[PDB]
C-alpha cells in the first residue's frame, strides 16, 4: 500500500524531475510531508500494474492521452478544483483532462513536436519533407546528415503520417467514433511510405532512437531533429546554434503532431489525496513551481495563465504552439493505448522491412478496431 504522510511522484525521464524535486522540497519545508520524485522506465505501463494493487505513486505525470484508460480502470481519484482555481488555467487544458463528464487530472503544460535545426549548418531550414533527400545528399558529402529523430516511438512519426490524411479516431459532433480509425487510409499510407523511402534511400536509419538522434544533433552531426520542449535544455548545454520552427509540410499540407497536455493524476488508492491536491494546486501550479521545473527541462506552453504570459515571449514556445495548432489534441479515450501500440508496431515493421507499409498499416488498423 501507499505510505501515508508523504508524496511519491512519478514523472517521465525526459522531464524535469530534479526541478520537480525542488518544488517537493519547498512543499516539505512549508507543510511537512516529504516528496520523493522518481522516473521509472516505462512508467505509463508500470503505473496501471502497480496502481491496480493499490500501490504506486500518489501522483502520476504523463501526457493526458493515457488518463482515460487509467480512469476507466478505477486508478484515478476525483479532482475537484474550485472555480477560482479552474480560472487560473486555460479551458482547452482542462478539456484534455475531462473524461466521462469529469476532470481526471490537473493539466500542467502543452507539448507539441517542432523542427529543431542547426542554424550554422542550415540557416534556411526546409519547408517541405520532399526537399529533405536532396538536402541529405548535400550534407552527406560533408560528412553530416540532414535529419535524425526517434523512429522507435510513433509519437515522432505520426505528424508525417497524419499530414496527408491519417488520423486516430474520427471526431464528429462532439464525439469520438472508436470504429472509425484512419490508420490504413491513403493519407496514412502516403506519409509512412515517404518515411520508409527515406530509410530505403539511406537518408535515415530504421534503428535510430531518442538517444541516438539527440546525441547526433547535439554533437552537430545532423542538421535537424524533431523533438519537444523538454529537449531544449540538453541542446542549450551543447552550445549548438539552434532554432525551433514549423515542421515541414508533406504533399503541401502541414505536419500534424499529436498535442499532449502533460498532466498530473492522483492515485485512487492514495491515502494522501489532500496532500496531493495541496501540492499540485498551491505549490506546483504557481509561477514559482512551474519555473523550477521549467528551468530544469522546459515544459512547453504551460497551462497556468500567469506563467504562460512569461513563457509566450520565447520564440521556441511560439513555434511549439504554431505546430500545436496545425496538429490535434490527442484523445484521452481508453482506446488510445491500443492505437499507440498498433501504430508503434506498424512503423517499426515498415521501417525495418519486416512488412510493407500497406500490410503494416492494414494490420494496425485491424488490431485497433
UniProtKB/Swiss-Prot annotation:
Mitochondrion listed as a keyword: no
Annotated GO MF terms: carbohydrate transmembrane transporter activity; maltose binding
Keyword terms: Periplasm, Signal, Sugar transport, Transport
Record InterPro entries: Maltose/Cyclodextrin-bd, SBP, SBP_1_CS
SUPFAM superfamilies: Periplasmic binding protein-like II
Compartments where found: Periplasm
GO cellular component, one term: ATP-binding cassette (ABC) transporter complex, substrate-binding subunit-containing
One GO BP annotation of this record: maltodextrin transmembrane transport
Function, in words: Part of the ABC transporter complex MalEFGK involved in maltose/maltodextrin import. Binds maltose and higher maltodextrins.
Family: Belongs to the bacterial solute-binding protein 1 family.
Subunit and interaction comment: The complex is composed of two ATP-binding proteins (MalK), two transmembrane proteins (MalG and MalF) and a solute-binding protein (MalE).
Protein name: Maltose/maltodextrin-binding periplasmic protein
Source organism: Escherichia coli O157:H7
Gene: malE
Amino acid at each position: 500500500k501507499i505510505e501515508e504522510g508523504k508524496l511519491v511522484i512519478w514523472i517521465n525521464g525526459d522531464k524535469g524531475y530534479n526541478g520537480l524535486a525542488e518544488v517537493g522540497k519547498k512543499f516539505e519545508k512549508d507543510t511537512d510531508p516529504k516528496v520523493t520524485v522518481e522516473h521509472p522506465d516505462k512508467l505509463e505501463e508500470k503505473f496501471p500494474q502497480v496502481a491496480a494493487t493499490g500501490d504506486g505513486p500518489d501522483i502520476i505525470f504523463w501526457a493526458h492521452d493515457r488518463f482515460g484508460g487509467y480512469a476507466q480502470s478505477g486508478l484515478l481519484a476525483e479532482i475537484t478544483p474550485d472555480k477560482a482555481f479552474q480560472d487560473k488555467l486555460y479551458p482547452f487544458t482542462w478539456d484534455a483532462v475531462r473524461y466521462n463528464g469529469k476532470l481526471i487530472a490537473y493539466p500542467i503544460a502543452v507539448e507539441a513536436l517542432s523542427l529543431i535545426y542547426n542554424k550554422d549548418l542550415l540557416p534556411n531550414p526546409p519547408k517541405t519533407w520532399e526537399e529533405i533527400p536532396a538536402l541529405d545528399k548535400e550534407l552527406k558529402a560533408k560528412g553530416k546528415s540532414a535529419l535524425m529523430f526517434n523512429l522507435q516511438e510513433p509519437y515522432f512519426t505520426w505528424p508525417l503520417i497524419a499530414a496527408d490524411g491519417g488520423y486516430a479516431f474520427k471526431y464528429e459532433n462532439g464525439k469520438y467514433d472508436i470504429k472509425d480509425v484512419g490508420v490504413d487510409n491513403a493519407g496514412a499510407k502516403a506519409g509512412l511510405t515517404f518515411l520508409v523511402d527515406l530509410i530505403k534511400n539511406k537518408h535515415m536509419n530504421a534503428d535510430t532512437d531518442y538517444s541516438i538522434a539527440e546525441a547526433a544533433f547535439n554533437k552537430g552531426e545532423t542538421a535537424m531533429t524533431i523533438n519537444g520542449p523538454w529537449a531544449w535544455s540538453n541542446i542549450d548545454t551543447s552550445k549548438v546554434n539552434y532554432g525551433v520552427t514549423v515542421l515541414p509540410t508533406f504533399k503541401g499540407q502541414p505536419s500534424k503532431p499529436f498535442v499532449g497536455v502533460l498532466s498530473a493524476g492522483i492515485n485512487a488508492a492514495s491515502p494522501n489525496k489532500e496532500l496531493a491536491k495541496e501540492f499540485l494546486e498551491n505549490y506546483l501550479l504557481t509561477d514559482e513551481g512551474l519555473e523550477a521545473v521549467n528551468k530544469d527541462k522546459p515544459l512547453g506552453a504551460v497551462a497556468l495563465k500567469s506563467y504562460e504570459e512569461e513563457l509566450a515571449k520565447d520564440p521556441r514556445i511560439a513555434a511549439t504552439m504554431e505546430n500545436a495548432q496545425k496538429g490535434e489534441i490527442m484523445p484521452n479515450i481508453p482506446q488510445m493505448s491500443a492505437f499507440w501500440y498498433a501504430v508503434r508496431t506498424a512503423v517499426i515493421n515498415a521501417a525495418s522491412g519486416r512488412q510493407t507499409v500497406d500490410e503494416a498499416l492494414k494490420d494496425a488498423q485491424t488490431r485497433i478496431t
